[PDB]
Amino acid sequence: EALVSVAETFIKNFDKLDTKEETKQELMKHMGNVHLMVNEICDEYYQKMRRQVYVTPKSFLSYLNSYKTLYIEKYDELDQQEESFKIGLNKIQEATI
Amino acid sequence: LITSLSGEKDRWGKGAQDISDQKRKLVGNVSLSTAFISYCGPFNAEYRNKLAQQRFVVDMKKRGVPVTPGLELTSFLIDDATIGEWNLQGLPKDDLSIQNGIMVTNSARYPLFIDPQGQGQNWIRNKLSASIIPERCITTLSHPKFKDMFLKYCMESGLTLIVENIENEVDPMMDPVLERQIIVKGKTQFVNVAGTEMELSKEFKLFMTCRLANPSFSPELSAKTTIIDFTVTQSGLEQQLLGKVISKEQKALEDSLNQLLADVNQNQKDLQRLDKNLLERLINSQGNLLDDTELMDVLNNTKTQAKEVAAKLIDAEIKTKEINEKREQYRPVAIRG
Amino acid sequence: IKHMFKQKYFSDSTYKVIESLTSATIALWNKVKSTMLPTPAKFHYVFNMRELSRIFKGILTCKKDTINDAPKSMKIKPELFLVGLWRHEAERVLADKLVNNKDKDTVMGYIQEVSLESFSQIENEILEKYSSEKTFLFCDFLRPDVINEDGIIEEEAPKIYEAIDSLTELRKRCNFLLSFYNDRNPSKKMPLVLFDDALKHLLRISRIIRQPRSSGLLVGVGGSGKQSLTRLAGFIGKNLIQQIIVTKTYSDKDLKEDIKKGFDDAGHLGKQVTFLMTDSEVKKEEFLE
């Protein structure tokens, strides 16, 4: 609930993120659930291989920021390509009519 | 003109639908992949697959987050050319090392390398050859005047220093650099280190090489810096050796694909010019579409270029099945080796 | 306890729970001390008689009027509220030390077992209301009486120890206090989100800063919200924050001056002062001495 509650606040700050409002609430839970599953694998990874990997709340803040930056760059590239394709399609449709 | 316009319109509509689907897939893919970048680094090859392909992919499908079903990480995050570049640098061809590479470029936090044998170091040395200098850029954690000789000079200049023999425990004076907390006056970005402010350029990079097989890092340390397991593993070497056997044996087949794929990537770009050229020129032309011969020509020309591309992409997909059958047959050599 | 809460002011049922408090905490203490043993890890676990002192310190800070007002403000009998207070205060001394979530759940049992057997008269009404999952927390700052129009023009909020029923009602108050802190300290911005556990921690820290002659030791892996919540608690508390400035020139002599300015603020003039220390601020082990 802590990780999910942090993920909520980060999604609302994320203005450029365009999706369904239903989807965002699934993503929120996913973001948090991710950080638990890593902590469950860390403990398994200590028993199975005797290697200690430390994940902290600070790491959860950093992962979210990295994800947001990557998503923004990918979204900007996709949006410019989509806008060019849409303009071309509209011109082609007008020409065909 | 009707036939050409109908074909062009169908292709454009398919592309727009594909782009919307791709954007939803990209949000899901970024969620699956960014998770990989931030967390999966310190784990071995087996556990990265377990932590991403078995845990996160399962989580996604249940939640109903829109994600591409295959989502090959290597393909999505980085171009196939830049992988080709890292091989020339010295980054091995095996799957783990590629990801290790990807994490270094895409991480906001300063990377840390676990490698007992400097394979990850010898890659970061061959890359960034312009920004790296041989003398007074590489130091050990412990030096008489580590701070004022190396660190201070490298921040001021913006040259990529590489910390050597980190040996598990990191010095607390370095903490503020790893944090990236900056007191900004203008554009200088002065960073305090043990009380003393130091001019940090944006181009400065830090790399920290552990030379121990199993280092025990503190949570504060593991949070401050992204930890990358660069260790050579039997399952890792196998995939390098398999790479080297395929380059030697059935060379002619593998080469023809590498030629075809390079010529296909060209023909995608080539087609992108002609359909662009039409869009630019079909607005500029305006009236009397039926007597506009210079435009009409490229509309028929685009379709031949599109048909050509479509035929190669089918043949490309066939050759990737061919080479993968040979990848299975020559597996026993590599694994033995 | 008999001097601080008198027979006259309280109802006949309420004062039967007051007499029971003193007998109760000891029954709980013995069960807790016999099950949670000191080891190389979890070394602090060991329970002293300071931990019995501190439990009560919590109960006696919660005023007579607030326990008699419980039927109006908390919409529960006064006798019930009082056990609610006890449960919280026992928890804040015994449960807060415990390092993992499993060892907390065991102790929450021993608080519930005891409560039911010590307060037999209101057992059936205790059992249904009080669980480890449900939240009946206490703070001093609950009251929204600080309006903060052009500073604190409308007196101040009487810093009284009250109960809050829901975390959601609490979140609105605490969110307003955070947003206000950022307004008052504009140089050092504190962007923070108050989730269910973070709110609990803020009350826990604001309790320790409030009680007379009590220092707090916050143990977390790092970036766990320790520092941020401390500066908020201090700000809500209306007490001055002092933080050691670490420079190479600064040494054991300068610390002594920085502590001296603390006593100069605290002992002299009569200002509530919270001295803040982290791993970072301890340059050498002599400072910590």
Ligand SMILES: Nc1ncnc2c1ncn2[C@@H]1O[C@H](COP(=O)(O)OP(=O)(O)O)[C@@H](O)[C@H]1O
């Ligand atoms: N409850 C929280 N809400 C928002 N941010 C938090 C929270 N807990 C930790 N953080 C973030 O993690 C970092 C940890 O620092 P802080 O909690 O102030 O002290 P410490 O580093 O000792 O935990 C902070 O910079 C803060 O932004």
Ligand SMILES: [Mg+2]
């Ligand atoms: Mg912190």
